[PDB]
């Protein structure tokens with residue numbers, strides 16, 4: 001992955017997000033509810049020290065993890081988290097990768113709605129990536145624990 | 149679905165195909181190996197009477213079904229099968245739909261290779277359809293029973 005958000009203000013991504021779409025390098029990273037990269041983002045909480053606290057749902061448990069910051073403002077560690085793109089107000093695109101290469105990305109949105117602009121920009125960003133599974137969820141599913 | 153292949157010669161789609169990509173209206177139609185629309189096409193055999201015999205794999209059993217012809221050359225019955233597009237020699241795009249509306253489509257290719265033109269044309273055809281899961285398989289997986 002070589003698309004990172006230039007000049008990211010991590011402070012301004014704080015608050016509520018919806019995992020609208022997810023894609024991944026291997027089907028088995030996203031196919032089941034229990035699949036390893038099937039994580040639904042609930043809230044992003046940037047620390048004052050510039051680390052990133054993530055609230056997510058995983059099959060339906062609430063979970064807290066911290067993405068520690070790096071020399072690069074758009075990259076964090078946990079497995080690396082890269083912020084591709086965001087307008088802070090509506091959408092955020094990010095990716096997760098390990099070091100084998102297993103890779104998963106998400107289109108996050110602020111509200112439980114189908115943002116077609118945000119999905120275009122998501123599909124554009126995936127054209128360069130070797131994804132073999134893509135999921136997308138409706139407004140109903142977005143308002144349920146673990147998108148059931 | 150309102151993209152059908154004009155002037156389809158069903159005779160000329162006979163022989164060997166590979167289920168390279170699959171998309172579907174609902175995740176649960178494609179997520180597991182046992183998912184209802186997770187069918188891998190092996191061979192297409194058009195009858196002289198103009199019906200279509202389908203050999204497929206389903207989780208790993210071989211299976212035979214006949215798609216009976218209709219007044220429209222690009223539409224068959226089993227649940228309806230619509231042939232969107234094909235160049236006979238390389239790719240075929242089709243869709244399956246019931247009457248609720250549960251809908252699944254496939255990019256078939258002649259050989260076990262990743263045809264980027266055929267996937268473009270597949271993605272173009274899905275832009276108009278309400279798909280929530282898409283899968284794609286590598287050359288290795290294409291040469292295995294049920295794409296394991």
Ligand SMILES: CCCCOc1ccc(OCCCN2CCOCC2)cc1
Pocket residue numbers: 036039041044052054056058063065067078081082083092094096
């Ligand atoms: C731009 C910031 C968005 C980053 O959001 C996430 C980054 C990494 C994630 O990783 C999930 C890792 C899975 N954990 C271990 C297994 O149980 C669930 C938590 C999840 C969200």
Ligand SMILES: CCCCOc1ccc(OCCCN2CCOCC2)cc1
Pocket residue numbers: 184187189192200202204206211213215226229230231240242244
């Ligand atoms: C252009 C012709 C391609 C059509 O290929 C297929 C059409 C319909 C299919 O339907 C699968 C229905 C599932 N059957 C019942 C459940 O067990 C497996 C067979 C499969 C391939």
Ligand SMILES: [Cl-]
Pocket residue numbers: 114137138139
């Ligand atoms: Cl939708």
Ligand SMILES: [Cl-]
Pocket residue numbers: 262285286287
């Ligand atoms: Cl591939």
